[PDB]
Design a protein around this ligand. Structure first.
Ligand SMILES: [Ca+2]
Ligand SMILES: [Ca+2]
Ligand SMILES: [Ca+2]
Ligand SMILES: [Ca+2]
Ligand SMILES: [Ca+2]
Lengths: 395, 395, 395, 395, 395
């Protein structure tokens, strides 16, 4: 029953056969100290060529072997404040950081590793390796793990790798298409036969129940478009596009930085609590931003970019939310809504209601279905500002 | 003779038979530590299922018994600074807080209870119970009271309750329609026959007196729409929608919070003194808000939402007022004005003037009547910011 | 030759017979500690019923006697810093404050009396009464005086008053119409016959002298509309509508307060020096108010209400001026300009130039006349902010 | 080649016979301690009646004598920091201050004399008079000087003056028209005959040289309109209209004061360096002024009054400039541009190019001439803010 | 694939024969202590007449000799922090500063030389000369060098110079046209014959590859227009138009100064990181600049001048960038884009794709060519703000 801004702002394109294909270019250079990954929503995997940045694997350029080694790592997720390794415990895993920041405290907090960093190199070769620093995850993120035993097995598999390891001991174009499959929001509406036979003259309680069902389906559509793992702007956004606040509250400097990272930003999406926090920051700074009109409707904006409320963005127990800056379009590579119309029996252009059966208890069943998905044409189309403290007040 | 903004901004819908029906959904979950209530204007009553949050009544799920227990509590109102219970006095009542904040000072101010809180649990079971804290009401509000004797009587009534109590000693959907009945503003206009016979050529003093009567009736309509107890935005507003100022003056952060709680806010209603206080806060913060045009009329606004003056909002002796943020509409669930037109003898579409009789003293009597009421379709349509200090000046 | 904003903004209505009638309602309640007065421009008189607030006259309700007592008081005006009574001097007068603030310093400045206050009660009864405080007028204002001898004479006149005094010793509706008489701005233009006979071909020096005469008459019209005593916005404004600045400079908080007191304010009138002071305050506060267009002409405004310069508002030697906030209209009760057109011989719709005579010295005389006045339909139509310090600069 | 704002904004009126007449009213009252002067550009002369403010000449009212005495004073100009008189030197001159401020330091800086002040009274009568204070000119200005010998000669001329002096020893209307004569910007363009015979097919180097000549003439026109002594806004502006900055940088308070002194100001003229300084002050104060559109062209403005750049306003070696606020028009008494069109041989409506002769060296000569002047109808049409420090930066 | 603002904002003019001619006037006066240079992109050369400011060459006015001496100097570039001369090392070179600032530290940092300064005079005459100060280049710039031996050779060449040197020992107009030659962006597109024979029905992969080639060519066009040495706004901008920030971050005062130096500025060009830094400065100052619409597109602006992002402006390792303020036009002397259309075989108005050959390996080759250049009609058309710190955050 709430306002659905993402549904009415994202353009909808018609897929054929319930599938879509997006061609991805992944530019990456070796030697720069950062490992680049391939991300498919929430599932991530290291680029096989990038894997060569590791010294113990430098100058090895057999595509088969690198691909196998890349395939044998395991993805793990860590929450804020969770301890991953502890000082004193023997080291047996190589950790490649894909997202988040992790502060390492030695026996003296050395520094904080971030996206593209590695720790655990020496643990791979010798069995005497011991963790001398404690890594505490300051921010939630992902991390790839390469076990010593698996790499040893791969070494015992390829003779070329043995010889290269024994000898050492003494812009790249990568095309890989991404396939999007239409997800379904489905439900069963059970209407008693009496309610369909009698209550049908001045208003249809069947039609009113169907409208309520459609509204619930649309709310689920928005919640999935925001929070789903395979597709979904919160999770299926490039790791480089996700920024951290300088101080924690959503100061206007953070909004300027969020607008810096991409061209032609269309709008901001944030929780209403987050919008209140941004307004508090604006009042503290003493500036009054203008409001712009979209569709004959006035809306708060920053630098002319409208800020739209979305209640489906989660609020963490620590009262920290996130802000999304995103451009929409097909001619300009942005975010599109994949949706198939022309269904066999449409109550609405995107909907399909079909009579299922009548039970022995005289209850008619209807199947209400809609098919939807989201596509991001280029990586630099959605930026996310994370860990935004929304419970800060002037003191 | 003053401007009537609420009369000209609230849409008016035609009721049939002088009555209206509003369907209410009351979502509530058990175990979360807050008791949810059903509010009909100023009269409040505890939800029978919510009553189960009490430990001494946990796991009892007989609808009849819970309904009876809920029916046997008494609603009481407390003003700011009034002491409800005192330390040392024996405890004999269970108090469930429906609105307001109450600070409890022990023998050391422990904390402040708020809406949905309970105190007086142990007073229900044993007669030795004694109040060890003094509860001072910092803000005016309501409170439900459950006496020990009444609960004991209910226990002596239901055998199932006795057995459950003896054993312990060792999202829910609730539909309940709300009915609105049209209220009447009526008056008698006494015009002497001489004034109707002679003073009728160039101007009608009868018609001028009728216009003055109509203006007085409209002023009474506004005062009732604001301050009435059964219906009326000040009292018939959800307890969750009523917020307290962070500091006491109406700072722009408070306005941002007031706009946060509901979607598509239409306008603000405040006393002109309150508007002056808000302007003083704006000048202190150094920001100059824009002004928007409604009906070809310029008006001060915040974030594009016009702020309309209403002199019918009371000012307390402590010089504290309240602000109302409210959206209006029928297609969008908001606040509507129930009014019946097509009266038997209409001087105006909503009015009815009828000749009553002529007295022995040659005085003609006229009956001027109008029928009006207010409906709030959804709970999240009117928000109230309370205890707004309007007598604060820079120092 | 200057811009005449009041002439071009005040609507002009046509009076019949050179007179106008305004019906006044004066609501007043007894017992509230303030005495209400009837004001006709600069002449003020106490309401006879209000006079009952005095204890020594409480419960006396003979209309004739109260009217007589009210008629026998004398109005006096006091300037800022003038001492009215001195400590030690015997008290013989009862003083009722109608306007201004007066600080009383005892043998220790007790407090400051204001509009509606009384001091000198006991001086009325006994002859031993002595002034024990010195009253210094901090602000210019008026004051009603009731002498002991006059009240004693009235007592000796009415037997009922004697009995009531001897016994004690042991919302009201009052209609009183106000009549406005059109004032005249007149002058005599003396043109030599030679100047009318010769200098008439390419330009008329007679017509140029007439235009200069008309401009002088219009300037006098504005000066009288502002500064006249009988009519005139500066003096014929309600004592409750006149406010004092919180600090002395015209801070924007003062403008907000000035806009608070009345509905639908049309514009502000202030001296250009006052406008410069307001701009200095705006710059100090750091806010830049918008400008609005009236008649295709841009003008500075506050909260959308245009601020118009008027050089006829006096500047005191202490460099303190006043600001006027006023709404104009006839359908909305405000300030109207009474003016009669259709004169026997009109050079202009409101003007009348008539040949008088030719002197023996061959000098033609012309009489240039215009008739004008101002009416204030309701008391809450003109508000005045007084003692505005306009010579304050940042330091 | 630069933008010429004054040329395109000043209205141009056609004079007849190359001359214009402006009628001046000079209101002045005696006894107020200030001497009023008549200014014709840069040449100033004391009003004969005002001369009576001097005590030694009080009550003498012979028009011939006063006119003679007024005629026998000499005008002198002083720069900032220049010492005019020194302590110890015998006093022999009476100095009347027409413009600027001069600080006098005694044996202790007494005070600062300003426009309309006098010093050197006693030096006129006795020969023993000695300067006991040193007068240092803080600001550039003018000063009238009356020598003792000249006044003594005038005394020896008029018997009436002798008798009046011997006896003492024991609003006025003054019309005086101002005549404006059109100035000429002239030049000679020498084009070789070969350049006129050959280089004439695809483009005319003769026509290109003529366009360059016209541009140079227009630049000279602007420089004279700004900086000329007889006419010219910088010098031919009323001494009362010239203000001094409160602090030295062009703070917005100074702009408000500049707008205070005259009605209907059209625009500001300042050097681009001065505009940069004003922008720096605006940024320091934290306010962002709006921009207005004239002729479809956006331009910075203050209070809706556009600020136009003019590079012809001089910058002193001390990096101090001046700002001009001026209204333009003929129906509203302001600043007009006198210019005669319809010349015998016009290349442009205001221009005249005429063939002069061909030299023996086969060089054709052309005479390019334009006639222009400026008129100020009323004294209060141009205000000048002087000694504006434009080299101030935040520290 | 990024937005190309410079391509769509610069007007394009059609050159004839692939060449353009710009007539330059170089006004310079002798004796003012600054040497003026002639700049052709990145190549600079001293004006021969200006060379006379040197004392050892004063009063020598033989054009041939001065031209020869000017021709025999060598241009050198210095980076920030690079030491050019060291104390103690013998002096053998005369250094004329053309751009940048160089701080000289003696045995005590004396001062900082800047554009037009000279150091090394005495090194020219005697061989005993020794550097007594160390010159450290605080900012990158250019510098002309005149060796002692070369000047001695020129002296031994001209007898007149010997005599003038022996004797001493005891606004100018200079026209020099600038020629612009069109540069070419060329590439070869290799398409396999199979891809051209089969993949041609529903979409042409040949046409898609051609579009990608065109986009790459346009990106190279922008990068050359910004960063090229011969032409290019960053390098081919007048040395007087290049300003240094007062503090280092791009404060609004710096933008005001950048707008001060030229008339009718069209737009600003800066890196998106620089735009973020400017927004941070605006938020710190507390002012919110307006946004203007160009081509129906909203864009941030300062004082109404739009600020356009350009990613081709380099960012130094010290995180310092530059800002460009530039006006565009042909009728108003500014920056124009030289481009020739009407090519023999145009895929696009400015493009030319031509079939080259088919290789023995059945690979078709296409030649994609475009011709472009940039012209700056007057020196005061592009201003550059340099060393702008873009990594500054509030602390
Ligand atoms: Ca890499
Ligand atoms: Ca609950
Ligand atoms: Ca009273
Ligand atoms: Ca005088
Ligand atoms: Ca020079």
């Amino acid at each position: 029953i709430t306002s659905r801004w993402l549904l009415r702002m994202l353009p909808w394109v018609e897929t054929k056969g319930g599938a879509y294909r997006v061609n991805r270019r992944l530019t990456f250079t070796v030697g720069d100290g950062r490992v680049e990954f391939v991300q498919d929503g929430s599932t991530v995997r290291v680029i096989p060529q990038e894997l060569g940045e590791l010294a113990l694997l430098r100058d090895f350029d057999d595509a088969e072997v690198l691909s196998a080694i890349a395939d044998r790592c395991v993805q793990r997720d860590f929450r804020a404040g969770e301890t991953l390794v502890e000082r004193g415990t023997a080291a047996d895993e190589l950790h490649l950081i894909a997202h988040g920041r992790i502060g390492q405290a030695s026996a003296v907090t050395l520094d904080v590793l971030a996206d593209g960093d590695r720790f655990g190199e020496h643990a791979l070769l010798d069995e005497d390796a011991r963790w001398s620093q404690t890594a505490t995850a300051e921010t939630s993120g992902t991390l790839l793990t390469l076990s010593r035993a698996d790499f040893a097995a791969v070494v015992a598999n390829s003779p070329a790798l043995r010889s290269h390891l024994a000898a050492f001991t003494a812009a790249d174009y990568e095309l890989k298409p991404r396939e999007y499959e239409l997800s379904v929001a489905q439900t069963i509406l059970r209407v008693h036969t009496r309610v369909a036979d009698l209550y049908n003259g001045p208003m249809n309680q069947t039609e009113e129940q169907l409208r309520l069902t459609i509204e619930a389906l649309r709310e689920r559509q928005e919640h999935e478009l925001i929070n789903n793992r395979e597709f979904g702007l919160l999770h299926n956004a490039d790791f480089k596009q996700r920024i951290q606040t300088h101080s924690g509250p959503p100061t206007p400097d953070d909004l300027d930085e969020l607008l810096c990272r991409r061209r032609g930003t269309k709008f901001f999406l944030a929780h209403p609590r987050t919008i209140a926090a941004m307004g508090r920051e604006f009042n503290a700074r003493g500036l009054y931003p203008d409001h712009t009109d979209l569709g004959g409707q006035q809306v708060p904006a920053w630098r002319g970019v409208p800020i739209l409320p979305c209640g489906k963005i989660p609020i963490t127990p620590e009262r920290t939310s996130s802000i999304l800056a995103l451009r929409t379009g097909e001619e300009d590579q942005g975010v599109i809504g994949l949706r198939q119309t022309g269904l066999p029996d449409e109550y609405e252009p995107g909907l399909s209601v079909r009579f299922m059966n009548i039970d022995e208890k005289a209850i008619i069943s209807y199947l209400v279905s809609t098919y939807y998905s989201a596509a991001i044409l280029v990586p630099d189309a959605v930026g996310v500002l994370e860990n935004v403290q929304i419970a800060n007040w002037p003191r």
